[PDB]
Amino acid sequence: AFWCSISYYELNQRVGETFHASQPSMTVDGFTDPSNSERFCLGLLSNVNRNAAVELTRRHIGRGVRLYYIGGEVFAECLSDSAIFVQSPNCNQRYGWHPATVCKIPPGCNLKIFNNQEFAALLAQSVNQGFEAVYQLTRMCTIRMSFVKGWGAEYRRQTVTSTPCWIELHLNGPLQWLDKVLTQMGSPSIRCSSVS
Amino acid sequence: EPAFWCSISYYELNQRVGETFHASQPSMTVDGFTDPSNSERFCLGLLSNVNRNAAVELTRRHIGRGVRLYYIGGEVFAECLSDSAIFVQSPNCNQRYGWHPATVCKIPPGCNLKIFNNQEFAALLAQSVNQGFEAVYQLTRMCTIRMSFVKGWGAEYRRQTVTSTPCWIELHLNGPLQWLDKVLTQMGSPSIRCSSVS
Amino acid sequence: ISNHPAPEYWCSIAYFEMDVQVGETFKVPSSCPIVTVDGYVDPSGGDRFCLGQLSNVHRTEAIERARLHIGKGVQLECKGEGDVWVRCLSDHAVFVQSYYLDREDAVHKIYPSAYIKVFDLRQCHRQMQQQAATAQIGVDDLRRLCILRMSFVKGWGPDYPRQSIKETPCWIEIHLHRALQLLDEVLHTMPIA
Numbered sequence: 001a002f003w004c005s006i007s008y009y010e011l012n013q014r015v016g017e018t019f020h021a022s023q024p025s026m027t028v029d030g031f032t033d034p035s036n037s038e039r040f041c042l043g044l045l046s047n048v049n050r051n052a053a054v055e056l057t058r059r060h061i062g063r064g065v066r067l068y069y070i071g072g073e074v075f076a077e078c079l080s081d082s083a084i085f086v087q088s089p090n091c092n093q094r095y096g097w098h099p100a101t102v103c104k105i106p107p108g109c110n111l112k113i114f115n116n117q118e119f120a121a122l123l124a125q126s127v128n129q130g131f132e133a134v135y136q137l138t139r140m141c142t143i144r145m146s147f148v149k150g151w152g153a154e155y156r157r158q159t160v161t162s163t164p165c166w167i168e169l170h171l172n173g174p175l176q177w178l179d180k181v182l183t184q185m186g187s188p189s190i191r192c193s194s195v196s
Numbered sequence: 197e198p199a200f201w202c203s204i205s206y207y208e209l210n211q212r213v214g215e216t217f218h219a220s221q222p223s224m225t226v227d228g229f230t231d232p233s234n235s236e237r238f239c240l241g242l243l244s245n246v247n248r249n250a251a252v253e254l255t256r257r258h259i260g261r262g263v264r265l266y267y268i269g270g271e272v273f274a275e276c277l278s279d280s281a282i283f284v285q286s287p288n289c290n291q292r293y294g295w296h297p298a299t300v301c302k303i304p305p306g307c308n309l310k311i312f313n314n315q316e317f318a319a320l321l322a323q324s325v326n327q328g329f330e331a332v333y334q335l336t337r338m339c340t341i342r343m344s345f346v347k348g349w350g351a352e353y354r355r356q357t358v359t360s361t362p363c364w365i366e367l368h369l370n371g372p373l374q375w376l377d378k379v380l381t382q383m384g385s386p387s388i389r390c391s392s393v394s
Numbered sequence: 395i396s397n398h399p400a401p402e403y404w405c406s407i408a409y410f411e412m413d414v415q416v417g418e419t420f421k422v423p424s425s426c427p428i429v430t431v432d433g434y435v436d437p438s439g440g441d442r443f444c445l446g447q448l449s450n451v452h453r454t455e456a457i458e459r460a461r462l463h464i465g466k467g468v469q470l471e472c473k474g475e476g477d478v479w480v481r482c483l484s485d486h487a488v489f490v491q492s493y494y495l496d497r498e499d500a501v502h503k504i505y506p507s508a509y510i511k512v513f514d515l516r517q518c519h520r521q522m523q524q525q526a527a528t529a530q531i532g533v534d535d536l537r538r539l540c541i542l543r544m545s546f547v548k549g550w551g552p553d554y555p556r557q558s559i560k561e562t563p564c565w566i567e568i569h570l571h572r573a574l575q576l577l578d579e580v581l582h583t584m585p586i587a
Contacts, residue, residue, distance in 0.1 A: 001233065012246050017419055018215055032537060033578040034571045035402045043533045043581070044574050046541070046567060048413055048560055050534070059532040059587050081586060135257060138230055138242060161246050168244060172232045175242050179231040182241075187279055192258045194281055194348050198438060210451050216418055333462060336435055336447060359451050366449060370437045373447055377436035380446070385485055390463045392487060392549050 003069055006040055007168045010054045012161035016045035025068040027079065028167055030061030030147075042165070057164040061147045065105075067169070072116030074171070076145065078105045085150040087160070088113045088143045093122075099139075102152040113143055119174050123181060131185040134178070141174040198370040201267050204238055205366045208252045210359040214243035222267045225277065226365060228259030228345075240363070255346045255362040263303075263343060265367070270314030272369070274343065276303045283348040285358065286311040286341040291320075297337075300350035311341055317372050321379060329383040332376070339372040400424065401571035404472045407431060408567045409445055411457055413560040417448030424571075428471040430483070431566060433464025433546070445546075445564065460547045460563035467546065468504075476515030476572035478542065482508050489550065491543040491559065494518070501551030512542060518573045522580040529584050536580075540573035 006019040006028060019028075019040040026037075032044040042061060047054070063079030078084045085102045091113050092101040105111050119140055126133045146166040151157040160166050200218040204226060207213060217226075217238040224235070230242040240259060245252070261277030276282050283300045289311045290299040303309050317338055324331045344364040349355040358364050407420040407429075420443040422429045428441065435447040445464055450457075466483035473479055482488045488504040492512040495502045504510060518539050525531050545565035550556040559565055 005232070007244075009246065014246075030533060031578045031581050032533070032540070032574040034406070034569070034574050036397070041578065043578075044537060044540075044569060046408070046537075046569070048410070048415075048567075055532065055534045058534055062587075132257075135241075141230075141242075142244065170232070170242060170244075175230045175232050179229050179239070179241075182229050187260060188257055192254060192280065192346060194346060195353060196347075203437070205449070207451075330462075333446070339435075339447075340449065368437065368447065368449070373435050373437045377434050377444065377447075380434050385465055386462050390460060390486070390547060392547065393555055 002172055004067075004074075004172055005170050007170075008040075008042055008045060009160075009166050009168065010047055010050060010164060013047070013049070015047045016042070021067070025066070027064055027066045029064030029079070030058055031063075042167075051164075054164040057148045061165060064147065065145060066110075067113075073112055074114040074143075075110055076105060076113045077110035078107050080147060081107050082148040083107065083150070084148075085146040085152075085163075086111060086113055086143065087145075087152070089140050090114045090119055090143075094118065100152060102146075102150060104150060114171060114174075116173065120177065123177060127181060127185070131188055134182055134185050137178050138175070141171045141178060143169040143171070145169070198374060200370060202265075202272075202370055203368050205368075206238075206240055206243060207359070207364050207366065208245050208248060208362060211245070211247065213245045214240070219265070223264065225262055225264045227262030227277070228256055252362040258346045259363060262345070264308075271310055272312040272341075273308050274303060274311045275308035276305050278345065279305050280346040281305065281348065282346075283344045283350075283361075284309065284311055284341060285343075285350065287338045288312045288317055288341075292316065298350060300344075300348060300352075302348055312369060312372075314371065318375060321376060325379060325383070329380075329386050332380055332383050335376055336373065339369045339376065341367045341369070343367070399572070399575060401575060403571055404476075405429070405470065405478070405571055406569040407443055407470075408569075409443075409448055410560075410565050410567065411450055411453060411563060414450070414452060416450040416453075417445070422470070424472070427473070428469055430467060430469050432467035432483070433461055445566075457563040464546045464564065468544070470568065473511075474515065476513075476518070476570060476576075477511065478513040478568075478570060480504060480508075480510050480512050480544075482506050484546070486547050487549070489545040489548075489559075489562075493521070493539060501549055501553070503549060513570060513573070515570075515572060515576070518570075519576045519580075522577055526580050526584045532587070533581060537574070537577060540570050540577055542568040542570065544568065 002020045004021045008016050023038045028040040030043045031041045033041050060082045066077040084105050087102045089099040146163040149163045202219045204217045221236045226238040228241045229239050231239050258280045264275040266273040282303050285300045287297045344361040347361045403421040404424040405422050409417050431443040433446045434444045436444050469481040471479045482504045490502045491500045494514045545562040548562045
């Protein structure tokens with residue numbers, strides 16, 4: 001199976017094809033190996049409308065980040081020689097800060113970016129809130145990471161779309177459980193017209 | 197006969213969102229839910245769009261069970277599982293009832309419609325050989341069908357282009373395209389040449 | 395033991411129409427030494443990459459036009475571990491951008507029926523270490539050496555109305571996998587930046 005797919009972005013532009021992770025432990029780096037099920041190499045992804053900044057930052061992605069699925073938990077280890085910022089709603093809500101919290105991971109460090117049981121339990125209590133409350137859990141199945149530059153509060157790059165090189169992760173397991181609950185939540189109350 | 201009888205591409209206004217889906221199963225659904233690994237379900241609910249506005253986000257909540265696409269025999273049907281209508285623009289379908297090829301048919305909830313017919317297309321492909329390369333090349337538009345979720349477009353609505361709707365997809369019928377190819381690779385080339393500077 | 399060399403694909407083709415990639419990237423298996431990129435419409439992949447069946451909302455009247463002439467298009471064949479040859483099966487010309495063709499600044503217009511060599515792996519490989527040495531110049535500069543660009547019908551360069559390939563109504567960018575594999579190796583040897 002794939003446990004997660006990864007989409008790379010340069011600013012607010014989507015660059016390259018979506019990588020599908022088949023291996024429990026892989027890497028997203030700035031190198032160019034095209035046929036490695038354990039290496040999403042960003043170096044080999046072109047972008048005809050790529051600016052100097054972007055080009056400059058790509059050079060510092062180096063060995064990048066190592067993502068890895070131990071049991072029901074995901075970890076991100078910064079191999080690059082530059083930091084990597086992580087925005088994990090599942091990670092943030094564990095230490096409390098306003099879901100949008102970006103957490104810096106200095107070179108040689110590593111953080112637990114997602115926990116299954118936690119999620120599963122957040123999915124359980126959401127059924128009581130109604131459709132809308134469950135529909136929004138898809139954000140909990142996503143994790144965003146910037147390479148070299150940071151964003152949010154503390155840096156004047158307030159949004160991910162501002163950073164030069166970032167990547168979004170979709171957790172398939174969490175998304176599949178979410179889907180099973182969602183197909184049973186009924187429908188919205190608030191209606192929606194065909195002309196407006 | 198193709199592995200995938202069609203491929204489906206999702207769009208949010210004039211922007212391609214998510215990867216192209218290739219249908220292997222005779223019957224499947226394009227819905228707004230979140231299962232990422234089901235060959236019978238193209239789930240739009242998990243697709244993300246950094247540039248997504250409120251209108252799109254509002255309409256994606258109404259896709260629901262979506263549309264069910266069927267390939268029965270040599271025909272294709274579209275059923276509306278969503279609690280909101282769906283609008284389709286199928287030239288193959290439209291010509292059969294004689295509506296300006298750019299007619300958008302509304303399929304209310306619970307309803308369905310024969311959106312494509314193979315033999316019909318095949319016949320149109322036959323009597324086109326007689327009109328030249330041009331005529332045939334344009335039979336690719338017959339091989340594509342566009343559907344919009346929740347909001348209609350074209351005549352009858354203010355939105356006149358499918359690119360104006362918040363959530364829409366585009367189908368490509370591989371069988372039809374393949375049969376077309378065979379006849380194209382033989383239609384010679386266009387007479388009215390093309391510079392290298394114009 | 396656990397991998398390399400030998401790429402699964404020997405190249406990747408990304409179609410474009412001005413500054414926008416249209417359709418999804420075409421990956422050619424190493425088992426398919428020759429690939430054809432024509433303006434026809436057979437969706438099935440394999441050995442044929444039909445640009446005539448790719449949709450685009452932004453597409454104009456000027457491009458529908460040009461696309462009409464891609465015709466039998468060209469062919470890309472892999473000869474030696476990573477050497478690529480081009481053969482213009484189109485009634486119209488083709489404009490190729492190749493460094494190997496520079497050693498021999500481009501818009502090397504290829505003439506109908508022509509069968510030319512456009513890339514030499516070794517020459518590429520050499521040239522990489524060439525850049526890695528002087529550094530001891532980033533990954534985006536050097537990955538270019540593993541890339542080929544090719545416009546169908548219209549041309550650009552310092553002698554046409556169109557200044558860059560991002561202006562042609564329809565073109566493609568080809569990434570040579572082996573050349574990139576050697577480049578992944580070279581990259582590990584350009585000590586920190």
